User: Fold this.
Amino acid sequence: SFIKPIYQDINSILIGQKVKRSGHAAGEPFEKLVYKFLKENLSDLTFKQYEYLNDLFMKNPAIIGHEARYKLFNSPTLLFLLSRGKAATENWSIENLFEEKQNDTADILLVKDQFYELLDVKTRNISKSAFAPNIISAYKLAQTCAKMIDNKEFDLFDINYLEVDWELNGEDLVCVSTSFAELFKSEPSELYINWAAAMQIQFHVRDLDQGFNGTREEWAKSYLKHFVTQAEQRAISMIDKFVKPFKKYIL
Amino acid sequence: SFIKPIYQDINSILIGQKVKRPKSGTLSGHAAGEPFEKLVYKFLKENLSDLTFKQYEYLNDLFMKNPAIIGHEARYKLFNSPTLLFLLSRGKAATENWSIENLFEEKQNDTADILLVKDQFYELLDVKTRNISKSAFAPNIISAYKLAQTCAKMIDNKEFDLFDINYLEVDWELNGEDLVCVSTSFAELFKSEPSELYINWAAAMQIQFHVRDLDQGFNGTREEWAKSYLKHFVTQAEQRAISMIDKFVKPFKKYIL
DNA sequence: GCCGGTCGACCGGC
DNA sequence: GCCGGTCGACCGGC
Ligand SMILES: [Ca+2]
Ligand SMILES: [Ca+2]
Assistant:
């Protein structure tokens, strides 16, 4: 992780900051200032996901078309996580340019020497009761592991997280704490997948275990086994909860 | 419906009207067009003053009027309906801790947007906003499961004339600096054919549609609508259980077996 | 045209 | 302590 090192400096620079308004339930602007720090202390590595695609496309003008522009990622896995649709890629131009999209996998992307660090910022209102937030689609992760195994890409990227905790005074959100964690350092089989919540894995960054000791490959195989098993159980529990209880009303 | 009777008015006072573009610079999300929503509510507060409440306001008023009723148990009786209670209540502890100095505030997952109530009849209104130029992805309308529980309670308690669940969409267009209201739409969930409702299971098990497209040609009873929807919900839940297997299990076995 | 997966957080029941 | 449902939007591959 390129963020692990300066973490603490970013922790200390974040505590005290204030973003304006928990009615709308969004401490999202905190993401912006984390980027503010990273863009200064780590200039040539920090990219907003859309900013990175603009760059990859701007440094290869002779290359156009959705088919060729996709080849530029040189990784089916990286391609899957960061690329945009065919038309969006077919239509991209130095005059059109990608903007930010609600669907992007990561908030900030740190690249350096063919290596990527997908950073996703999480914001928690620590005043309220603990409720694990969506982290990432468990299905997206599933497909990603499949593509990792298939293509042997086990040293290309990591998916890390930064949890900015905040408290509200009267009319200003103030950061009280921060937390950092790595996805691939956790135990796969113990990642909670909430099927109803957009099949999102859910956990507070401050509570994720970081004791995984196997390899990146073993991680992906373990997770996949976990995913398949939970998928099977979900089907059974969907029957006991959404079918059996409503049988009497059916005639 | 309290809205429909004056829908022509809301529409005839909304069309062409223009409001500022989101300060956030963007143009996507609940943010863009929100002023249109504040406009609709203010119109409602100005013309249906004794019927308009935000969900939390209705609850504050309900408990404020019976200051002698304390404890969630008794406080839950003030609803005089197991169905209404299910749709609007705030939770045991929060109902227990409610006080004239600790009132309810807007909550992210509240069932209703705007409540129009009169003579114990409730209209759960959802005032929505849409950018017809972009917008081509149907939004989450309401949890299919919440509806399922709602219908069961309606059947068990035989409450088929207690409430309606309607929609008021405000379609706008970007005009450089402003937002112009190009049109409005009104639809009633209970005038829709139950089995024609699309339940997106991955999307928080939410029913999804635009409203401008909601079917409004159901001609049966409320009870029928309920039994019918429940039928649709059970059958669709079965399919989904099968789909999951075909989609999330099978294609991944070759990696684990 | 038809279908459905994904981002962002956020309580209350058992 | 611990599990999981709900709100509001959003876009591209068949
Ligand atoms: Ca994020
Ligand atoms: Ca609304």
Summary: DSSP finds nine helices and nine strands in chain A. Chain A has one domain: 1-251.
